Design an enzyme around this catalytic site. Structure first.
Site, mmCIF file in Angstrom:
data_model
loop_
_atom_site.group_PDB
_atom_site.id
_atom_site.type_symbol
_atom_site.label_atom_id
_atom_site.label_comp_id
_atom_site.label_asym_id
_atom_site.label_seq_id
_atom_site.Cartn_x
_atom_site.Cartn_y
_atom_site.Cartn_z
ATOM 1 N N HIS A 1 -5.261 -3.037 -6.414
ATOM 2 C CA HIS A 1 -5.862 -3.322 -5.119
ATOM 3 C C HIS A 1 -6.098 -4.781 -4.720
ATOM 4 C CE1 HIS A 1 -8.052 -1.983 -1.595
ATOM 5 N NE2 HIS A 1 -9.168 -2.575 -1.987
ATOM 6 N N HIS B 1 3.816 -2.370 -2.615
ATOM 7 C CA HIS B 1 3.882 -2.624 -1.177
ATOM 8 C C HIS B 1 5.259 -2.809 -0.594
ATOM 9 C CE1 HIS B 1 -0.295 -2.795 0.021
ATOM 10 N NE2 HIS B 1 -0.590 -3.591 -0.993
ATOM 11 N N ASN C 1 -5.283 2.652 -1.267
ATOM 12 C CA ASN C 1 -5.906 2.657 0.046
ATOM 13 C C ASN C 1 -4.901 2.741 1.168
ATOM 14 O OD1 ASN C 1 -5.330 -0.108 -0.973
ATOM 15 N ND2 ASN C 1 -6.172 -0.785 1.042
ATOM 16 N N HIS C 2 -3.645 2.448 0.854
ATOM 17 C CA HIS C 2 -2.578 2.468 1.848
ATOM 18 C C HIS C 2 -1.798 3.774 1.926
ATOM 19 C CE1 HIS C 2 -2.450 -1.765 3.337
ATOM 20 N NE2 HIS C 2 -3.014 -2.036 2.173
ATOM 21 N N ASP D 1 3.585 -0.570 3.272
ATOM 22 C CA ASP D 1 2.989 -1.653 4.058
ATOM 23 C C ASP D 1 3.287 -3.055 3.531
ATOM 24 O OD1 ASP D 1 1.915 0.176 5.898
ATOM 25 O OD2 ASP D 1 0.001 0.317 4.822
ATOM 26 N N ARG D 2 3.256 -4.036 4.430
ATOM 27 C CA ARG D 2 3.529 -5.443 4.119
ATOM 28 C C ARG D 2 4.972 -5.754 3.726
ATOM 29 N NH1 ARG D 2 0.241 -8.556 6.840
ATOM 30 N NH2 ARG D 2 -1.975 -8.173 6.347
ATOM 31 N N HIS E 1 -6.962 2.980 -8.107
ATOM 32 C CA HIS E 1 -6.517 1.881 -7.272
ATOM 33 C C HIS E 1 -7.569 0.824 -7.000
ATOM 34 C CE1 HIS E 1 -4.288 -0.459 -4.424
ATOM 35 N NE2 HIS E 1 -5.231 -0.287 -3.512
ATOM 36 N N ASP F 1 -0.472 2.086 -3.500
ATOM 37 C CA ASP F 1 -0.145 1.001 -2.561
ATOM 38 C C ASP F 1 1.363 0.746 -2.563
ATOM 39 O OD1 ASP F 1 -2.821 0.464 -1.724
ATOM 40 O OD2 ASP F 1 -2.433 -1.707 -1.763
ATOM 41 N N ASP G 1 -0.102 -2.596 -7.473
ATOM 42 C CA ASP G 1 0.564 -2.705 -6.167
ATOM 43 C C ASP G 1 2.055 -3.108 -6.113
ATOM 44 O OD1 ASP G 1 -2.196 -2.449 -5.756
ATOM 45 O OD2 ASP G 1 -2.058 -3.524 -3.815
ATOM 46 N N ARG H 1 -14.143 -6.364 2.591
ATOM 47 C CA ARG H 1 -13.064 -5.570 3.156
ATOM 48 C C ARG H 1 -13.500 -4.722 4.340
ATOM 49 N NH1 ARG H 1 -8.359 -5.268 -0.100
ATOM 50 N NH2 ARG H 1 -8.637 -6.086 -2.237
HETATM 51 C C1 LIG Z 1 -6.894 -3.856 5.028
HETATM 52 C C2 LIG Z 1 -8.012 -4.650 5.245
HETATM 53 C C3 LIG Z 1 -8.849 -5.167 4.071
HETATM 54 O O1 LIG Z 1 -8.175 -4.915 2.836
HETATM 55 C C4 LIG Z 1 -9.061 -6.665 4.294
HETATM 56 O O2 LIG Z 1 -9.835 -7.205 3.210
HETATM 57 C C5 LIG Z 1 -10.160 -8.588 3.399
HETATM 58 C C6 LIG Z 1 -10.810 -9.168 2.141
HETATM 59 C C7 LIG Z 1 -9.594 -9.452 1.251
HETATM 60 C C8 LIG Z 1 -8.407 -9.182 2.180
HETATM 61 C C9 LIG Z 1 -7.331 -10.061 2.055
HETATM 62 C C10 LIG Z 1 -6.536 -10.140 0.921
HETATM 63 C C11 LIG Z 1 -5.373 -11.137 0.895
HETATM 64 C C12 LIG Z 1 -4.703 -11.088 -0.480
HETATM 65 C C13 LIG Z 1 -4.350 -10.867 2.004
HETATM 66 C C14 LIG Z 1 -3.279 -11.953 1.881
HETATM 67 C C15 LIG Z 1 -2.416 -12.014 3.141
HETATM 68 C C16 LIG Z 1 -1.084 -12.765 3.125
HETATM 69 C C17 LIG Z 1 -2.831 -11.379 4.308
HETATM 70 C C18 LIG Z 1 -4.020 -10.664 4.385
HETATM 71 O O3 LIG Z 1 -3.673 -9.272 4.387
HETATM 72 C C19 LIG Z 1 -4.778 -8.379 4.608
HETATM 73 C C20 LIG Z 1 -4.294 -6.928 4.683
HETATM 74 C C21 LIG Z 1 -3.604 -6.498 3.387
HETATM 75 C C22 LIG Z 1 -3.216 -5.020 3.482
HETATM 76 O O4 LIG Z 1 -2.437 -7.299 3.178
HETATM 77 C C23 LIG Z 1 -4.568 -6.691 2.212
HETATM 78 O O5 LIG Z 1 -5.504 -5.875 2.106
HETATM 79 O O6 LIG Z 1 -4.348 -7.653 1.439
HETATM 80 C C24 LIG Z 1 -5.469 -8.688 5.936
HETATM 81 C C25 LIG Z 1 -5.910 -10.150 5.962
HETATM 82 C C26 LIG Z 1 -4.695 -11.043 5.706
HETATM 83 O O7 LIG Z 1 -5.136 -12.401 5.625
HETATM 84 O O8 LIG Z 1 -4.925 -10.979 3.316
HETATM 85 O O9 LIG Z 1 -8.971 -9.370 3.485
HETATM 86 C C27 LIG Z 1 -10.981 -8.788 4.673
HETATM 87 C C28 LIG Z 1 -10.167 -8.265 5.859
HETATM 88 C C29 LIG Z 1 -9.756 -6.806 5.641
HETATM 89 O O10 LIG Z 1 -8.891 -6.393 6.715
HETATM 90 C C30 LIG Z 1 -8.461 -5.020 6.658
HETATM 91 C C31 LIG Z 1 -9.584 -4.056 7.053
HETATM 92 O O11 LIG Z 1 -10.152 -4.457 8.301
HETATM 93 C C32 LIG Z 1 -9.040 -2.627 7.131
HETATM 94 C C33 LIG Z 1 -10.115 -1.623 7.561
HETATM 95 C C34 LIG Z 1 -11.370 -1.781 6.701
HETATM 96 C C35 LIG Z 1 -9.584 -0.189 7.484
HETATM 97 C C36 LIG Z 1 -8.261 -0.080 8.244
HETATM 98 C C37 LIG Z 1 -7.735 1.355 8.191
HETATM 99 C C38 LIG Z 1 -8.814 2.302 8.715
HETATM 100 C C39 LIG Z 1 -10.099 2.104 7.908
HETATM 101 O O12 LIG Z 1 -9.849 2.431 6.535
HETATM 102 C C40 LIG Z 1 -11.016 2.219 5.724
HETATM 103 C C41 LIG Z 1 -12.157 3.132 6.179
HETATM 104 C C42 LIG Z 1 -12.468 2.876 7.654
HETATM 105 C C43 LIG Z 1 -11.181 3.033 8.465
HETATM 106 C C44 LIG Z 1 -10.703 4.488 8.429
HETATM 107 O O13 LIG Z 1 -10.538 0.744 8.019
HETATM 108 MN MN LIG Z 2 -5.200 -1.818 -2.043
HETATM 109 MN MN LIG Z 3 -2.794 -3.636 -1.780
#
Ligand SMILES: C=C1[C@@H](O)[C@@H]2O[C@]3(CC[C@H](/C=C/[C@@H](C)[C@@H]4CC(C)=C[C@@]5(O[C@H](C[C@@](C)(O)C(=O)O)CC[C@H]5O)O4)O3)CC[C@H]2O[C@@H]1[C@@H](O)C[C@H](C)[C@@H]1CCC[C@@]2(OCCC[C@@H]2C)O1
Ligand SMILES: [Mn+2]
Ligand SMILES: [Mn+2]
Lengths: 288, 581
Positions: A236, A54, A112-113, A83-84, A162, A80, A52, A209
């Site tokens: 990832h 980003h 995934n991004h 984003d972010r 990824h 990736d 990653d 996730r």
């Molecule tokens: C992104 C994510 C997941 O990846 C994230 O997975 C979790 C577990 C671990 C992760 C956090 C990791 C931390 C390290 C970071 C650190 C920091 C500071 C921020 C943060 O950043 C996260 C987002 C991101 C990017 O930075 C990341 O993935 O790390 C969001 C939470 C936030 O606290 O966590 O959270 C739970 C919450 C999830 O939410 C979203 C999730 O709803 C997205 C959703 C599941 C997607 C969205 C696009 C559309 C679609 O595509 C998938 C198929 C279905 C649909 C089409 O559906």
């Molecule tokens: Mn990823």
């Molecule tokens: Mn990532």
């Protein structure tokens, strides 16, 4: 046209974005090249594996400071790019511009991004708007991401992707089988490869996730053994130490965006695979 | 306007009687055309008033007039030059007023003693006692030239005006008088220095305006020399001790700035009595500008204490103060000290240096502010010629080696840039034994930037030691990496050959580097191969044309047939640039 690509690259290294005009151009040529590539892209060593980024442009620059400049050093990024970070536009374009000028020196996978729905929630969509006034550069790029190779096999032994493994994919052939030329699906093989995470619970589990699965050691070992792989290389996931081993070294995670979101305080790493598929890690902090 | 003078005029612009610049400098010739008599009667008067604000001109005119003595009739007529110079003295843009004065001072000597009294002093006065202020600022630089040669009666007069000039109601006219007070004091009889100069001095030193006071420190040096050792405590020292204690740090700054000078002007005994304590107070001043100014003087000052009490006051009075500064907050200060501290070695001995300075040497060599350790590193020459090179290597080498292999690269990069310095200072024999290892070791570091850094570092080293030393000590080990299994290392080899061709010369490059480069044209990894094309395009120019055609042209043509896209593109490029295409 070659003197031009060099210019675009020199410009992009000064963190200066290309024009909607050229991004449209760069993106079509990148499409031609990325089409001929396999869902399981063949990559021969030596080559440095990156995770990653980003949009953290200046960290990407710190990366090149540590692993060498392109094209003297060969690279493989596992997706990736947007984003972010604050510079998704400059980052992804430098990388795509590097791929078109040096097809054999760089390999870019899809994360995934590199998708259309997630980039409209986490940055990339809006940043393009603040820098080009319309949504065109975003279409040219999200269209291009459909062509990014889902995975890469380095020297037929080290499998890189990824996210991770899928309950509906047991062999490399199953992957070559999938049709990757489309937005990323909400369920399925293509989706899991890009969303799953290795876990410390056995067999398959529910991913926190909301997409893909979690997979324990037993699953990796089987997957490795069945495919004659010595290692599964993925990103990832945020790894404080920059990189992490798990599943009795069947899996290794590589995160290349130091201090994620400018709040995490984690290190970043890149994995060097030499002429002999021998691996070494380079940990690094965010560039000043 | 009329010839021949009309020649000076610039009939082409749109000014107010402006003159041709490239002509006012060719003035000594128009003065030759019309004769001496006419140079006076018509050339000088014309110059006198015709004074526009064309500065580049007024300057030249002021300069030019200072050498016109003889084109006017010799000494007996030297005064004809006063009228136009008096004018030019009251102008604006100081640059001009300065010239006018430098010239007035010049021709004062041409004036005869009697003409000095008849036309010069009168000019001095009207200038001194003039209305406008510049007319006064400039008036101050004309007293020291005419004083000695005129009569006792006029001397008196001159002294009075110089006073009035010191006690002027304007800060500027006073600063001016103050910074010329020293010069004037130097040409007066002792009595009058005591009875007239001292009071003028005291007054200026206790001026309401600090801008004036700080300028009395410089005067103190001058006055302090002209007086005999005993008179100093009574007529000067109280004033000087008060200055070092002045409310305005600016004034204290000036005392720390002119310390070494006061130290000589005053003499060893007073330096031991009154100056050593002041120096200690200055190093402890609250304002960092002063502490630094003082710290800068450390080496020079101790160097000047009387041979007998020297070593003792240092270890007792100065040295404790220094240990304090090495810990100061402001890097401004740590910086100042660091640039001169190791200059104390000779003045303390191999035994003292090794026990009391080497510790401070280290405390700074491991300071944050990179400038600080760089100043320490830039001055090892003396510490080295005082204690043994083995004794220094015993206290420096570990500080280095400890940083050359540290946590973050950056800190490591920083140590790579001390190398050409350590080399040129500590010498080639030391470098070949205790440093060549660390420089080769970096050529293979994990971080790219570090390998890059250490690569161009070789060029900087060959500049220090020569092409001979390079072929015997560096090329052998650099070429060894071509065998290395990692492509990152083999490319590193070619990278060292690119930089080294720049300074190793045509012979060594053709004989001992070109072969290794051409040999790798068949490396298993594509990246090395195309970088071989690049390396040939780089060092090609240094190779004589025969070699270029027999050995380079061939290998390149081969590489253009290589399977890999990039080796091909770069092979071509190489040919097109070398003209072998
Ligand atoms: C992104 C994510 C997941 O990846 C994230 O997975 C979790 C577990 C671990 C992760 C956090 C990791 C931390 C390290 C970071 C650190 C920091 C500071 C921020 C943060 O950043 C996260 C987002 C991101 C990017 O930075 C990341 O993935 O790390 C969001 C939470 C936030 O606290 O966590 O959270 C739970 C919450 C999830 O939410 C979203 C999730 O709803 C997205 C959703 C599941 C997607 C969205 C696009 C559309 C679609 O595509 C998938 C198929 C279905 C649909 C089409 O559906
Ligand atoms: Mn990823
Ligand atoms: Mn990532």
């Amino acid at each position: 046209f070659t003197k031009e690509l060099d210019q675009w690259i020199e410009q992009l290294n000064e963190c200066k974005q290309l024009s909607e005009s050229q991004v449209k151009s760069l993106c079509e040529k990148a499409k031609e090249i990325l089409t001929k590539e396999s869902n399981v892209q063949e990559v021969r060593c030596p080559v440095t594996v990156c995770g990653d980024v980003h949009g953290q442009f200046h960290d990407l620059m710190e990366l090149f400071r540590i692993g060498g400049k392109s094209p003297d050093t060969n690279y493989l990024f596992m997706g990736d790019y947007v984003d972010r970070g604050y510079y998704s536009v400059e980052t992804v374009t430098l990388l795509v511009a590097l791929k078109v000028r040096y097809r054999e020196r760089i390999t870019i996978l899809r994360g995934n991004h590199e998708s259309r729905q997630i980039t409209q929630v986490y940055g990339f969509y809006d940043e393009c708007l603040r820098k080009y006034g319309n949504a065109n550069v975003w279409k040219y790029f999200t269209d291009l991401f459909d062509y990014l190779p889902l995975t890469a096999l380095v020297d037929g032994q080290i499998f890189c992707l990824h996210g991770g493994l899928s309950p509906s994919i047991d062999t490399l052939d199953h992957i070559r089988a999938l049709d990757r030329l489309q937005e990323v699906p909400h369920e399925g093989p293509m989706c899991d490869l890009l969303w799953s995470d290795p876990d410390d619970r056995g067999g398959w589990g529910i991913s926190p996730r909301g997409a893909g699965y979690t997979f324990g050691q037993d699953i990796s070992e089987t997957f490795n053994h069945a495919n004659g792989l010595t290692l599964v290389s993925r990103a990832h996931q945020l790894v404080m130490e920059g990189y992490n081993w798990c599943h009795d070294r069947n899996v290794v995670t590589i995160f290349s965006a130091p201090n994620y979101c400018y709040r995490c305080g984690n290190q970043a790493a890149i994995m060097e695979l030499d002429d002999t598929l021998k691996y070494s890690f380079l940990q690094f902090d965010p560039a000043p | 306007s009329l010839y021949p003078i009309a020649v000076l005029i610039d009939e082409l612009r749109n000014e107010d009687v402006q003159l041709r610049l490239n002509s006012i400098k060719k003035l000594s010739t128009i003065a030759l055309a019309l004769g001496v008599e006419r140079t006076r009667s018509e050339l000088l008067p014309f110059l006198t008033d015709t004074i526009y604000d064309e500065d580049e001109v007024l300057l030249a005119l002021a300069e030019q007039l200072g050498t016109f003595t003889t084109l006017v009739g010799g000494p007996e007529y030297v005064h004809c030059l006063l009228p136009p110079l008096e004018s030019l003295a009251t102008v604006e843009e100081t640059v001009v007023r300065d010239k006018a004065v430098e010239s007035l001072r010049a021709i004062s000597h041409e004036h005869s003693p009697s003409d000095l009294e008849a036309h010069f002093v009168p000019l001095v006065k009207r200038l001194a006692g003039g209305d406008w202020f510049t007319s006064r600022t400039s008036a101050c630089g004309l007293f020291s030239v005419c004083y000695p040669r005129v009569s006792s009666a006029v001397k008196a007069e001159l002294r009075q005006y110089f006073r009035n000039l010191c006690s002027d109601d304007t800060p500027m006219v006073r600063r001016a008088a103050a910074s010329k007070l020293g010069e004037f004091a130097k040409v007066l009889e002792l009595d009058n220095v005591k009875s007239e100069i001292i009071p003028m001095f005291s007054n200026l030193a206790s001026d309401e305006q600090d801008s004036v006071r700080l300028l009395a420190v410089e005067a103190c040096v001058n006055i302090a020399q002209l007086l005999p050792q005993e008179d100093l405590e009574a007529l000067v020292m109280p004033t000087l001790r008060q200055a070092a204690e002045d409310k305005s740090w600016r004034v204290r700054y000036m005392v720390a700035d002119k310390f070494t000078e006061l130290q000589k002007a005053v003499g060893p005994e007073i330096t031991k009595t009154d100056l050593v304590p002041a120096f200690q107070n200055l190093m402890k001043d609250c304002e960092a500008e002063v502490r630094a100014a003082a710290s800068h003087k450390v080496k020079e000052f101790c160097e000047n204490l009387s041979a007998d009490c020297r070593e003792n006051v240092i270890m007792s009075q100065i040295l404790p103060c220094i240990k304090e500064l090495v810990s100061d907050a402001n890097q401004h200060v740590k910086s100042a000290l660091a640039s001169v501290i190791m200059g104390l070695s000779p003045i303390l001995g191999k035994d003292n240096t090794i026990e009391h300075l080497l510790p401070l040497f280290l405390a700074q060599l491991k300071d944050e502010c990179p400038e600080v350790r760089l100043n320490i590193i830039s001055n090892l020459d003396c510490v080295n010629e005082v204690i043994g090179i083995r004794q220094l290597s015993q206290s420096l080498l570990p500080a280095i080696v400890e940083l050359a292999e540290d946590a973050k690269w950056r800190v490591r990069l920083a140590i790579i840039e001390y190398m050409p310095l350590l080399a040129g200072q500590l010498g080639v024999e030391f470098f070949d034994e205790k440093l060549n290892s660390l420089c080769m070791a970096w050529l293979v570091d994990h971080v790219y930037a570090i390998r890059e850094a250490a690569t161009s570092n070789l060029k900087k080293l060959v500049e220090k030691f020569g092409k001979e030393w390079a072929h015997a000590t560096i090329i052998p080990k650099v070429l060894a990496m071509s065998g290395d299994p990692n492509y990152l290392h083999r490319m590193t080899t070619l990278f060292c050959i690119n930089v080294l061709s720049e300074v190793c010369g045509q012979d060594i490059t053709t004989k001992h580097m070109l072969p290794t480069v051409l040999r790798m044209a068949g490396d298993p990894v594509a990246n090395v191969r195309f970088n071989v094309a690049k390396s040939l395009q780089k060092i090609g120019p240094i190779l004589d044309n025969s070699t270029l055609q027999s050995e380079v042209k061939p290998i390149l043509e081969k590489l253009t047939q290589d399977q890999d896209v990039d080796v091909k593109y770069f092979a071509q490029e190489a040919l097109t640039v070398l003209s072998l295409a």
